[PDB]
Amino acid sequence: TYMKIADYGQLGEYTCDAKCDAEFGEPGNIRHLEGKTYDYRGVFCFNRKNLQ
Amino acid sequence: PEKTIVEPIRLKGRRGKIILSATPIAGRPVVFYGGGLGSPLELIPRPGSNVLFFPYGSPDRFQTWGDCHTCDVESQLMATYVTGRRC
């Protein structure tokens, strides 16, 4: 499992002057993905007479 | 008369003596197939008898190493000819 940053998002605008205030903007986003591991198998046989 | 026979052969001997149970006619090539042989092969019999010598030099060997549906045992070797007389 691993993290990912979807987007940083915008934080803070070009506010005017003489304005005792500020703006909260818009926070980013962090997702948390994950993944498996798959197996691969097989089988094979002989007759032990021609093998000998 | 003029019967035709397809029959399996069970090899016998270190020189490869094949005994047929019906004495092929006279000069028609009796044909051996299966048994790992890549292609059917023909041989002339001796007139009146039913003993053949398998050529030690084998033409092909279509082996099938590794298989779990039949344990690649073998396909058995057959032989095909015609017997009896004409008239």
- CB–CB contacts below 8 A, A to B: 16
Classify residue A37 as left (phi > 0), alpha (psi -120 to 50) or beta: beta
Structure tokens at A12: 């803070």
Q: How far is CA B14 from CA A19, B18, B53, B56, B79, in A?
A: 110, 11, 10, 9, 19
Rounded to the nearest 5 percent, the helix, strand and coil shares of chain B are 0, 30, 70
Q: How far is CA A2 from CA A6, A37, B29, B56, in A?
A: 13, 14, 75, 67
How many helices (H) and strands (E) would you count in chain B?
A: 0, 6
**Given resolution (angstroms):** 3.5
DSSP string, A7-40: E---------SS----------EEEEE-------
Distance CA B49, CA A3 (A): 86
Reference A31, options A14, A49, A6; nearest CA is A6
* Among chain B residues, CA nearest to A50: B73
* Among chain B residues, CA nearest to A49: B73
Name residue B18's amino acid: I
Helix (H) or strand (E) holding B60: none
Reference A46, options B55, B64, B24; nearest CA is B64
- Tokens 């605008």 appear where? A13
End-to-end CA distance of chain A: 49
How far apart are the CA of A52 and the nearest CA of chain B, in angstroms? 13
The DSSP bridge partners found for residue A5 are A30
Burial of A43 (0-12, 13-18, 19+ CB in 10 A): exposed
